Amino acid sequence: PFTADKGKCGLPEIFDPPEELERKVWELARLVWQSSSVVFHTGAGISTASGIPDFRGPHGVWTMEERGLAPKFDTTFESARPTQTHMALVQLERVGLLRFLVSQNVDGLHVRSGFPRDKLAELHGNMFVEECAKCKTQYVRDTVVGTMGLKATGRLCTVACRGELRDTILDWEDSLPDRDLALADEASRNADLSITLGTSLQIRPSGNLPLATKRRGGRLVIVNLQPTKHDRHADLRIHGYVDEVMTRLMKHLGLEIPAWDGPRVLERALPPLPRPPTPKL
Ligand SMILES: Nc1ncnc2c1ncn2[C@@H]1O[C@H](COP(=O)(O)OP(=O)(O)OC[C@H]2O[C@H](O)[C@H](O)[C@@H]2O)[C@@H](O)[C@H]1O
Numbered sequence: 001p002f003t004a005d006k007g008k009c010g011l012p013e014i015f016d017p018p019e020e021l022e023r024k025v026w027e028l029a030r031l032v033w034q035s036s037s038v039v040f041h042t043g044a045g046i047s048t049a050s051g052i053p054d055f056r057g058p059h060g061v062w063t064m065e066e067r068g069l070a071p072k073f074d075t076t077f078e079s080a081r082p083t084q085t086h087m088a089l090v091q092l093e094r095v096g097l098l099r100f101l102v103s104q105n106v107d108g109l110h111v112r113s114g115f116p117r118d119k120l121a122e123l124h125g126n127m128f129v130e131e132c133a134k135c136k137t138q139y140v141r142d143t144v145v146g147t148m149g150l151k152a153t154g155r156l157c158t159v160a161c162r163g164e165l166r167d168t169i170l171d172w173e174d175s176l177p178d179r180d181l182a183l184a185d186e187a188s189r190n191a192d193l194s195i196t197l198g199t200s201l202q203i204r205p206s207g208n209l210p211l212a213t214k215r216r217g218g219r220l221v222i223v224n225l226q227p228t229k230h231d232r233h234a235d236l237r238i239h240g241y242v243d244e245v246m247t248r249l250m251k252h253l254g255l256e257i258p259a260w261d262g263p264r265v266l267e268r269a270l271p272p273l274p275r276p277p278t279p280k281l
Pocket residue numbers: 042043044045046048049054055056057060104105106124197198199200201202203223224225226227240241242243
């Protein structure tokens with residue numbers, strides 16, 4: 001708990017030089033076009049451009065703790081905006097290029113971006129979500145719920161119940177939400193393409209899900225500034241900023257990154273929008 005293994009922290013960053021970065025993003029476009037079922041895996045690296053620190057980056061939460069320094073927030077969680085990467089993921093879902101989305105992030109930004117909760121596994125919880133210990137009914141709040149480790153927030157259930165509301169933030173010893181883990185695993189096993197964005201892939205089982213795609217000859221793409229646990233298993237490793245990589249990908253795909261309306265919750269994926277015709281590859 002105090003001795004919890006925080007893994008490899010503060011590994012050097014790697015930057016693909018510009019011609020190499022351009023060729024690898026063109027190859028990522030090629031895999032998306034060819035794949036039937038694409039699953040995205042996100043971690044803390046996709047929120048660092050919103051001013052939320054990651055865990056194991058050069059200035060991450062655990063890296064700084066290890067050096068006796070403090071991580072720095074440039075926002076609250078309430079005032080944070082979805083990155084270009086978050087809104088790209090909204091669009092790829094809408095046009096049906098993204099089958100499912102698996103996140104380790106607690107920052108509440110996939111939800112708040114309007115990403116459909118029925119295509120989202122939030123494996124480590126959501127700072128904005130409390131759940132009735134009685135009926136399991138979830139509430140997505142406009143402010144962080146105020147506790148971590150699955151404690152009583154002090155609020156009660158309002159479903160026609162009065163059950164005790166608790167946070168959904170897992171502590172080190174807490175096993176993963178069964179529904180979210182089972183859907184993420186099923187999505188990962190069934191995928192022919194798994195793309196990792198801003199996760200070092202050091203947590204079990206979260207970080208191991210993308211390896212399930214390798215079963216039955218799926219492809220694995222890892223986008224990350226630092227080395228990751230599964231680098232040797234990747235068909236393609238892109239070392240660059242996830243916003244640079246995703247803006248370029250969207251341009252190759254002929255998709256706009258959509259406007260953020262402000263914090264909005266979508267329970268269920270809408271009908272799929274029209275998408276560009278595919279290139280002859
Ligand atoms: N803008 C960026 N572009 C690309 N890569 C980035 C960027 N920002 C950071 N990175 C990389 O993004 C990667 C983030 O790795 P980690 O910090 O381990 O976060 P996790 O989500 O995988 O942490 C998993 C869990 O462990 C924790 O205890 C919590 O429970 C977490 O939920 C780093 O390698 C950065 O190099």
